[PDB]
Amino acid sequence: DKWEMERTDITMKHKLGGQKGEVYEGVWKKYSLTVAVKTLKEDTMEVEEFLKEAAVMKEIKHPNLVQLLGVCTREPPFYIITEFMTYGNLLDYLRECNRQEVNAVVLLYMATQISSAMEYLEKKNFIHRDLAARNCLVGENHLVKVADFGLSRLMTGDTYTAHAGAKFPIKWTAPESLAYNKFSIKSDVWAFGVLLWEIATYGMSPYPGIDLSQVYELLEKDYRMERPEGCPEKVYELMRACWQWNPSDRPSFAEIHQAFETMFQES
C-alpha cells in the first residue's frame, strides 16, 4: 500500500509505556517530525489481528480520532506509526490539572469533541468497545482525540458477540454485555455516559467502594450513580438517558453531539 514505510525512516527516542507491546516516542527523520510508534511484542497478541487493526485505521479520517501516518508490515518487528499527542491520557490530565484553567466551559468543550468522534464512527458502521477516559489523549489548548486501535466493523446497528472467556472493565460495561456478551453502538452510548461522569468528577473512580460482583444486580434494580457536585442538571439528564436499561431507548450519538454543541455555543 501507499502506507508502507521503510523501517529506517524512523528512529526511536523515548519509551512511553508498555503489555502486549510497547509505545515509543520517535522521530520521522525526513520531516524532523515527532511521532508515536506502537510495536508488537513477540509473542503476545496474534499477528493477523495486529495487521487488521492497521487495515481498519487506514479508513479513519476525523479531527478527534488519532491519525494514522504509516505502517511497517514486511518483516518483524511490526510497527504502527501515528501522530503524537503531547499531554498523554485524559484521566491523569484531569486528576493533575489547574481547575481554574480547566473549568466548566472546558469540560463542555471536551464532551463536544468526544461525541463528535463517536457520531462519525456511528455513521461509518464502526464500534469502539472500550470507551473510557484512560483511552482518550490530550494535546495543546484542551484538544482531545479518541484512541482507535480496537475498532470493529459492524453495521449500524447489528450485534457483535464477544469470544467465550472474555473479561470486561465491569464499571464501564452495559448490562446486555455483562449478561450475554452482546455489544453494539448502544453499549458504546452506555460507556459514554460513564465517561461523562469521569469528566464531571475530574477523574474519580466510578461506583466508589461498590463490590464488582454486585454491580449487575444493582443495575437490574434501577440503581445508578448520583449527580456529581457541581454538575449541571441537563448534563446529568443526558447521563441518565445514556444508562436506560433497554438499548433502543438510549439516544444516538448524533443527538448527543447536537445537545452538547448547543450547550457549548450557549455558554
Side-chain angles (χ1 to χ4, degrees), residues 189-190 192-193 196 237-244 250-251 256:
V189 173
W190 182 287
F192 178 84
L196 283 179
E237 289 179 17
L238 268 171
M239 285 189 205
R240 292 297 295 259
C242 287
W243 299 332
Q244 290 279 350
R250 304 169 198 155
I256 295 177

Side-chain angles (χ1 to χ4, degrees), residues 30-40 42 44-74 76-201:
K30 54 186 298 186
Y31 294 115
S32 298
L33 173 71
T34 298
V35 299
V37 185
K38 192 180 186 66
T39 71
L40 176 61
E42 307 175 14
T44 48
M45 173 176 45
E46 203 270 327
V47 181
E48 304 289 348
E49 191 174 330
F50 191 76
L51 298 176
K52 179 172 179 176
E53 292 183 5
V56 168
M57 287 174 74
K58 289 171 181 176
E59 307 178 18
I60 303 294
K61 178 78 166 186
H62 189 275
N64 302 111
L65 285 155
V66 171
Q67 183 60 44
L68 178 73
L69 298 176
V71 298
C72 302
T73 69
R74 281 166 144 264
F78 302 101
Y79 295 158
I80 297 182
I81 302 127
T82 75
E83 70 177 311
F84 182 70
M85 309 293 302
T86 309
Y87 290 84
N89 80 82
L90 181 66
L91 184 60
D92 288 329
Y93 183 83
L94 291 170
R95 291 179 170 179
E96 297 165 358
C97 72
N98 178 351
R99 294 193 187 187
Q100 287 296 305
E101 171 198 341
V102 186
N103 58 13
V105 50
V106 175
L107 300 188
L108 280 178
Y109 182 47
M110 294 177 163
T112 304
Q113 292 177 85
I114 297 163
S115 68
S116 184
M118 294 312 105
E119 178 186 11
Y120 176 84
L121 296 182
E122 181 175 80
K123 291 186 202 313
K124 295 297 183 178
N125 300 308
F126 293 111
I127 58 178
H128 190 285
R129 303 180 309 168
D130 195 11
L131 194 57
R134 55 178 180 272
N135 290 327
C136 300
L137 295 168
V138 187
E140 290 83 358
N141 301 310
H142 314 302
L143 177 65
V144 180
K145 304 194 185 200
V146 185
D148 60 346
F149 286 106
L151 299 180
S152 308
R153 300 185 198 274
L154 183 67
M155 295 300 105
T156 318
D158 294 343
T159 297
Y160 151 86
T161 301
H163 66 281
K167 300 179 183 178
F168 310 136
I170 294 182
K171 291 184 172 181
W172 286 259
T173 303
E176 65 272 12
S177 304
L178 291 174
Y180 310 106
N181 280 17
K182 292 181 181 307
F183 289 84
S184 76
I185 193 69
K186 296 305 187 182
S187 40
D188 276 347
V189 173
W190 182 287
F192 178 84
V194 183
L195 172 50
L196 283 179
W197 193 93
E198 289 187 277
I199 292 172
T201 56

